[PDB]
Amino acid sequence: PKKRASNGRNKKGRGHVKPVRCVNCSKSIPKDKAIKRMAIRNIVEAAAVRDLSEASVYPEYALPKTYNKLHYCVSCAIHARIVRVRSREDRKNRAPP
C-alpha cells in the first residue's frame, strides 16, 4: 500500500524534475527526492584553532569556512544515519527537528 502521500519525493505539478547524483555512491536520483544537507564547516577543525592562531601572521584573521551542499540517495542517507526510519505517525512530521 501507499506509504506516503508525497510519495517519497516533492513533485506536485512537474512530471519530471532532473536527476542529481548521490555524493557517496553516485546513484542517479531526482533532485526533489534526493536528500539534501548543508555542510557548513570551519576550514580547519575545532582543536587547531589555537594552533592556527598561534602560527598566524595577520592576528585574528578570519577563520574561513567551507560550504558544501551534499546530495544523498535514500539508501546512503539511511545507512549514514541522516534520516533514520521513523514510526508511522511520526513520519508525517516535516520539521527540521
* Contacting residues toward RNA, per CB under 7 A: 1-2, 5-7, 11-13, 15, 78, 85, 88, 92
Q: Are 73 and 26 in contact (CB under 8 A)?
A: no
The total number of residues shown for the chain amounts to: 97
Residue 37 has phi, psi (to 5 degrees) of: -125, 155
- When the beta carbons of 40 and 85 are compared against RNA, the nearer one is 85
- When the beta carbons of 11 and 37 are compared against RNA, the nearer one is 11
Cα separation, 83 vs 7, whole angstroms: 16
- When the beta carbons of 7 and 56 are compared against RNA, the nearer one is 7
CB of 11 to RNA, least distance (A): 6
